[PDB]
Amino acid sequence: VEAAYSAYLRRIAEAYLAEHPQMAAPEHAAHVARVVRSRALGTPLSFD
Amino acid sequence: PRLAAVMPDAVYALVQGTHKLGEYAHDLVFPPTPEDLRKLEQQVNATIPREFDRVRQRYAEGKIANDEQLSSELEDASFNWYRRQLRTSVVGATDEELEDVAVRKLRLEPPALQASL
């Protein structure tokens, strides 16, 4: 379960940072991680 | 004759007559407003579509009709509004392309909540 879950977040992280290369800089080690955490559970819900 | 036609007319007449008698019961106890009749005047005026405003001005300046020429004038206004609404149904409105029609009839967008307040 450890390897499977880790590889799952890995795959989605590869997909994201390859989609938008601008924030693929280390400056976002807490930002792209904040996006991965939000994207591993479901879809980000807009308030409206 | 033809009870199937009489019954709906019977109930329609019943409820419409009751509505009239209620209006009478409300205009005598609470007398009508003197000037907010202009409020309702303009607020039933505002929802008249644009295709009818062409005769509204024609209704102001004398040359309306005798009684019959308007009753064949506003007919084509009704009909062009009809075909315009048909085109808005099928091909959409003036500022709206097929992608936005699919957006609207799929109910994809929510009503703007941030802009509400």
PDB file of C-alpha atoms in Angstrom:
ATOM      1  CA  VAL A   1       0.000   0.000   0.000  1.00  0.00           C
ATOM      2  CA  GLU A   2       2.906   2.343   0.756  1.00  0.00           C
ATOM      3  CA  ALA A   3       4.517   1.909  -2.664  1.00  0.00           C
ATOM      4  CA  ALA A   4       1.185   2.010  -4.511  1.00  0.00           C
ATOM      5  CA  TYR A   5      -0.028   5.205  -2.822  1.00  0.00           C
ATOM      6  CA  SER A   6       3.363   6.908  -3.129  1.00  0.00           C
ATOM      7  CA  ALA A   7       3.533   6.036  -6.824  1.00  0.00           C
ATOM      8  CA  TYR A   8      -0.017   7.342  -7.250  1.00  0.00           C
ATOM      9  CA  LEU A   9       0.882  10.774  -5.910  1.00  0.00           C
ATOM     10  CA  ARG A  10       4.084  10.514  -7.964  1.00  0.00           C
ATOM     11  CA  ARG A  11       2.160   9.940 -11.199  1.00  0.00           C
ATOM     12  CA  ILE A  12      -0.288  12.774 -10.598  1.00  0.00           C
ATOM     13  CA  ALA A  13       2.647  15.025  -9.654  1.00  0.00           C
ATOM     14  CA  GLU A  14       4.485  14.191 -12.871  1.00  0.00           C
ATOM     15  CA  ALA A  15       1.303  14.880 -14.831  1.00  0.00           C
ATOM     16  CA  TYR A  16       0.746  18.271 -13.199  1.00  0.00           C
ATOM     17  CA  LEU A  17       4.276  19.665 -13.272  1.00  0.00           C
ATOM     18  CA  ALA A  18       4.555  18.515 -16.888  1.00  0.00           C
ATOM     19  CA  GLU A  19       1.272  20.259 -17.739  1.00  0.00           C
ATOM     20  CA  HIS A  20       2.485  23.641 -16.396  1.00  0.00           C
ATOM     21  CA  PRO A  21       6.300  23.895 -16.449  1.00  0.00           C
ATOM     22  CA  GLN A  22       6.421  27.423 -15.002  1.00  0.00           C
ATOM     23  CA  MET A  23       5.887  26.431 -11.363  1.00  0.00           C
ATOM     24  CA  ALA A  24       8.132  23.365 -11.794  1.00  0.00           C
ATOM     25  CA  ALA A  25      10.825  25.414 -10.045  1.00  0.00           C
ATOM     26  CA  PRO A  26      11.853  24.505  -6.475  1.00  0.00           C
ATOM     27  CA  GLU A  27      10.308  27.803  -5.311  1.00  0.00           C
ATOM     28  CA  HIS A  28       7.022  25.850  -5.187  1.00  0.00           C
ATOM     29  CA  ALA A  29       8.152  22.902  -2.988  1.00  0.00           C
ATOM     30  CA  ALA A  30       5.230  23.935  -0.763  1.00  0.00           C
ATOM     31  CA  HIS A  31       3.008  25.100  -3.640  1.00  0.00           C
ATOM     32  CA  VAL A  32       3.036  22.189  -6.087  1.00  0.00           C
ATOM     33  CA  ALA A  33       2.854  19.946  -3.016  1.00  0.00           C
ATOM     34  CA  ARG A  34      -0.197  21.936  -1.894  1.00  0.00           C
ATOM     35  CA  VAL A  35      -1.704  21.244  -5.319  1.00  0.00           C
ATOM     36  CA  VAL A  36      -0.836  17.533  -5.250  1.00  0.00           C
ATOM     37  CA  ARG A  37      -2.472  17.166  -1.836  1.00  0.00           C
ATOM     38  CA  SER A  38      -5.606  18.823  -3.224  1.00  0.00           C
ATOM     39  CA  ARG A  39      -5.604  16.755  -6.425  1.00  0.00           C
ATOM     40  CA  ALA A  40      -5.021  13.333  -4.841  1.00  0.00           C
ATOM     41  CA  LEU A  41      -8.415  13.403  -3.091  1.00  0.00           C
ATOM     42  CA  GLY A  42     -10.775  14.767  -5.733  1.00  0.00           C
ATOM     43  CA  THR A  43     -11.605  17.934  -7.516  1.00  0.00           C
ATOM     44  CA  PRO A  44     -10.974  21.382  -6.037  1.00  0.00           C
ATOM     45  CA  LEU A  45     -14.377  22.873  -5.283  1.00  0.00           C
ATOM     46  CA  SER A  46     -14.934  26.545  -6.139  1.00  0.00           C
ATOM     47  CA  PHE A  47     -17.036  28.385  -3.501  1.00  0.00           C
ATOM     48  CA  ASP A  48     -19.785  29.306  -5.990  1.00  0.00           C
TER      49      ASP A  48
ATOM     50  CA  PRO B   1     -72.642  19.049 -25.689  1.00  0.00           C
ATOM     51  CA  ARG B   2     -69.190  17.403 -25.502  1.00  0.00           C
ATOM     52  CA  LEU B   3     -68.754  17.347 -21.729  1.00  0.00           C
ATOM     53  CA  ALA B   4     -65.025  16.797 -22.309  1.00  0.00           C
ATOM     54  CA  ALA B   5     -64.900  20.405 -23.527  1.00  0.00           C
ATOM     55  CA  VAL B   6     -67.464  21.754 -21.055  1.00  0.00           C
ATOM     56  CA  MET B   7     -65.718  20.651 -17.842  1.00  0.00           C
ATOM     57  CA  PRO B   8     -62.405  22.512 -18.390  1.00  0.00           C
ATOM     58  CA  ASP B   9     -64.321  25.623 -19.430  1.00  0.00           C
ATOM     59  CA  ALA B  10     -66.523  25.194 -16.365  1.00  0.00           C
ATOM     60  CA  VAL B  11     -63.600  25.079 -13.934  1.00  0.00           C
ATOM     61  CA  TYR B  12     -61.752  27.871 -15.752  1.00  0.00           C
ATOM     62  CA  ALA B  13     -64.819  30.106 -15.552  1.00  0.00           C
ATOM     63  CA  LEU B  14     -65.264  29.230 -11.877  1.00  0.00           C
ATOM     64  CA  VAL B  15     -61.732  30.175 -10.837  1.00  0.00           C
ATOM     65  CA  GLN B  16     -61.594  33.260 -13.075  1.00  0.00           C
ATOM     66  CA  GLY B  17     -64.901  34.527 -11.707  1.00  0.00           C
ATOM     67  CA  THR B  18     -63.649  33.947  -8.175  1.00  0.00           C
ATOM     68  CA  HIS B  19     -60.540  35.962  -9.076  1.00  0.00           C
ATOM     69  CA  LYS B  20     -62.692  38.816 -10.379  1.00  0.00           C
ATOM     70  CA  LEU B  21     -64.861  38.826  -7.252  1.00  0.00           C
ATOM     71  CA  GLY B  22     -61.718  38.841  -5.120  1.00  0.00           C
ATOM     72  CA  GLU B  23     -60.346  41.798  -7.069  1.00  0.00           C
ATOM     73  CA  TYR B  24     -63.634  43.605  -6.434  1.00  0.00           C
ATOM     74  CA  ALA B  25     -63.474  42.665  -2.744  1.00  0.00           C
ATOM     75  CA  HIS B  26     -59.969  44.158  -2.621  1.00  0.00           C
ATOM     76  CA  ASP B  27     -60.601  47.376  -4.573  1.00  0.00           C
ATOM     77  CA  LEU B  28     -63.486  48.508  -2.341  1.00  0.00           C
ATOM     78  CA  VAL B  29     -61.998  47.718   1.079  1.00  0.00           C
ATOM     79  CA  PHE B  30     -58.521  48.860   0.067  1.00  0.00           C
ATOM     80  CA  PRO B  31     -59.073  51.617  -2.502  1.00  0.00           C
ATOM     81  CA  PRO B  32     -56.719  51.674  -5.494  1.00  0.00           C
ATOM     82  CA  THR B  33     -53.418  53.528  -5.457  1.00  0.00           C
ATOM     83  CA  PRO B  34     -53.528  56.911  -7.231  1.00  0.00           C
ATOM     84  CA  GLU B  35     -49.962  57.019  -8.608  1.00  0.00           C
ATOM     85  CA  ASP B  36     -48.434  53.555  -8.139  1.00  0.00           C
ATOM     86  CA  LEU B  37     -50.779  52.665 -10.991  1.00  0.00           C
ATOM     87  CA  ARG B  38     -47.986  54.333 -12.979  1.00  0.00           C
ATOM     88  CA  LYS B  39     -45.477  52.050 -11.253  1.00  0.00           C
ATOM     89  CA  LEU B  40     -47.410  49.026 -12.496  1.00  0.00           C
ATOM     90  CA  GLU B  41     -47.984  50.844 -15.803  1.00  0.00           C
ATOM     91  CA  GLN B  42     -44.265  51.112 -16.509  1.00  0.00           C
ATOM     92  CA  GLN B  43     -43.408  47.730 -14.963  1.00  0.00           C
ATOM     93  CA  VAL B  44     -45.819  45.958 -17.273  1.00  0.00           C
ATOM     94  CA  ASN B  45     -44.445  48.191 -20.038  1.00  0.00           C
ATOM     95  CA  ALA B  46     -40.789  47.216 -19.456  1.00  0.00           C
ATOM     96  CA  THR B  47     -41.263  43.507 -20.236  1.00  0.00           C
ATOM     97  CA  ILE B  48     -42.873  44.161 -23.622  1.00  0.00           C
ATOM     98  CA  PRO B  49     -40.351  42.755 -26.138  1.00  0.00           C
ATOM     99  CA  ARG B  50     -38.546  45.026 -28.561  1.00  0.00           C
ATOM    100  CA  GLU B  51     -40.475  43.689 -31.568  1.00  0.00           C
ATOM    101  CA  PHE B  52     -43.618  45.250 -30.093  1.00  0.00           C
ATOM    102  CA  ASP B  53     -42.150  48.665 -29.248  1.00  0.00           C
ATOM    103  CA  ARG B  54     -42.340  49.413 -32.986  1.00  0.00           C
ATOM    104  CA  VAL B  55     -46.127  49.610 -32.721  1.00  0.00           C
ATOM    105  CA  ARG B  56     -46.049  51.207 -29.259  1.00  0.00           C
ATOM    106  CA  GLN B  57     -44.629  54.350 -30.845  1.00  0.00           C
ATOM    107  CA  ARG B  58     -47.087  53.762 -33.686  1.00  0.00           C
ATOM    108  CA  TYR B  59     -49.695  53.616 -30.917  1.00  0.00           C
ATOM    109  CA  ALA B  60     -48.644  57.028 -29.603  1.00  0.00           C
ATOM    110  CA  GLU B  61     -48.688  59.077 -32.819  1.00  0.00           C
ATOM    111  CA  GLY B  62     -52.210  58.905 -34.218  1.00  0.00           C
ATOM    112  CA  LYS B  63     -51.693  56.495 -37.113  1.00  0.00           C
ATOM    113  CA  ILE B  64     -52.404  53.399 -34.995  1.00  0.00           C
ATOM    114  CA  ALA B  65     -55.320  51.915 -36.974  1.00  0.00           C
ATOM    115  CA  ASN B  66     -59.075  52.259 -37.295  1.00  0.00           C
ATOM    116  CA  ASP B  67     -59.475  49.143 -35.219  1.00  0.00           C
ATOM    117  CA  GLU B  68     -58.413  46.392 -37.678  1.00  0.00           C
ATOM    118  CA  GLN B  69     -55.037  47.431 -39.098  1.00  0.00           C
ATOM    119  CA  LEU B  70     -53.274  46.981 -35.757  1.00  0.00           C
ATOM    120  CA  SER B  71     -54.958  43.598 -35.315  1.00  0.00           C
ATOM    121  CA  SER B  72     -52.997  42.559 -38.387  1.00  0.00           C
ATOM    122  CA  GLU B  73     -49.975  44.693 -37.534  1.00  0.00           C
ATOM    123  CA  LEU B  74     -49.012  43.160 -34.197  1.00  0.00           C
ATOM    124  CA  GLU B  75     -49.634  39.722 -35.718  1.00  0.00           C
ATOM    125  CA  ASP B  76     -46.380  39.822 -37.679  1.00  0.00           C
ATOM    126  CA  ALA B  77     -44.628  41.214 -34.607  1.00  0.00           C
ATOM    127  CA  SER B  78     -45.867  38.201 -32.651  1.00  0.00           C
ATOM    128  CA  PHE B  79     -44.697  35.941 -35.472  1.00  0.00           C
ATOM    129  CA  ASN B  80     -41.195  37.391 -35.804  1.00  0.00           C
ATOM    130  CA  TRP B  81     -40.814  37.193 -32.026  1.00  0.00           C
ATOM    131  CA  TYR B  82     -41.983  33.588 -32.387  1.00  0.00           C
ATOM    132  CA  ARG B  83     -39.382  32.703 -35.019  1.00  0.00           C
ATOM    133  CA  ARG B  84     -36.717  34.636 -33.110  1.00  0.00           C
ATOM    134  CA  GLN B  85     -37.444  32.593 -29.991  1.00  0.00           C
ATOM    135  CA  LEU B  86     -37.333  29.457 -32.133  1.00  0.00           C
ATOM    136  CA  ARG B  87     -33.860  30.426 -33.352  1.00  0.00           C
ATOM    137  CA  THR B  88     -32.776  31.201 -29.793  1.00  0.00           C
ATOM    138  CA  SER B  89     -33.969  27.716 -28.845  1.00  0.00           C
ATOM    139  CA  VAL B  90     -32.184  25.910 -31.677  1.00  0.00           C
ATOM    140  CA  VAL B  91     -29.234  28.003 -32.910  1.00  0.00           C
ATOM    141  CA  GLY B  92     -28.999  30.124 -29.762  1.00  0.00           C
ATOM    142  CA  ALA B  93     -29.040  33.852 -29.135  1.00  0.00           C
ATOM    143  CA  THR B  94     -27.068  36.650 -30.780  1.00  0.00           C
ATOM    144  CA  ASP B  95     -24.040  36.590 -28.473  1.00  0.00           C
ATOM    145  CA  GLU B  96     -23.984  32.835 -27.946  1.00  0.00           C
ATOM    146  CA  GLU B  97     -22.435  30.064 -30.047  1.00  0.00           C
ATOM    147  CA  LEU B  98     -23.011  26.292 -30.033  1.00  0.00           C
ATOM    148  CA  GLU B  99     -20.466  25.624 -27.281  1.00  0.00           C
ATOM    149  CA  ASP B 100     -22.383  27.997 -25.016  1.00  0.00           C
ATOM    150  CA  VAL B 101     -25.683  26.338 -25.960  1.00  0.00           C
ATOM    151  CA  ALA B 102     -24.245  22.981 -24.908  1.00  0.00           C
ATOM    152  CA  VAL B 103     -23.025  24.703 -21.741  1.00  0.00           C
ATOM    153  CA  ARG B 104     -26.461  26.124 -20.960  1.00  0.00           C
ATOM    154  CA  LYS B 105     -28.587  23.043 -21.656  1.00  0.00           C
ATOM    155  CA  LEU B 106     -26.120  20.742 -19.865  1.00  0.00           C
ATOM    156  CA  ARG B 107     -26.460  23.008 -16.802  1.00  0.00           C
ATOM    157  CA  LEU B 108     -22.678  23.200 -16.475  1.00  0.00           C
ATOM    158  CA  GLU B 109     -22.257  26.688 -15.004  1.00  0.00           C
ATOM    159  CA  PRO B 110     -23.500  27.759 -11.572  1.00  0.00           C
ATOM    160  CA  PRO B 111     -25.215  31.091 -10.933  1.00  0.00           C
ATOM    161  CA  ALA B 112     -22.515  33.607 -10.004  1.00  0.00           C
ATOM    162  CA  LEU B 113     -22.304  33.714  -6.205  1.00  0.00           C
ATOM    163  CA  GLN B 114     -19.378  36.121  -5.784  1.00  0.00           C
ATOM    164  CA  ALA B 115     -21.083  38.717  -7.984  1.00  0.00           C
ATOM    165  CA  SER B 116     -24.286  38.367  -5.925  1.00  0.00           C
ATOM    166  CA  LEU B 117     -22.728  40.184  -2.948  1.00  0.00           C
TER     167      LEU B 117
END
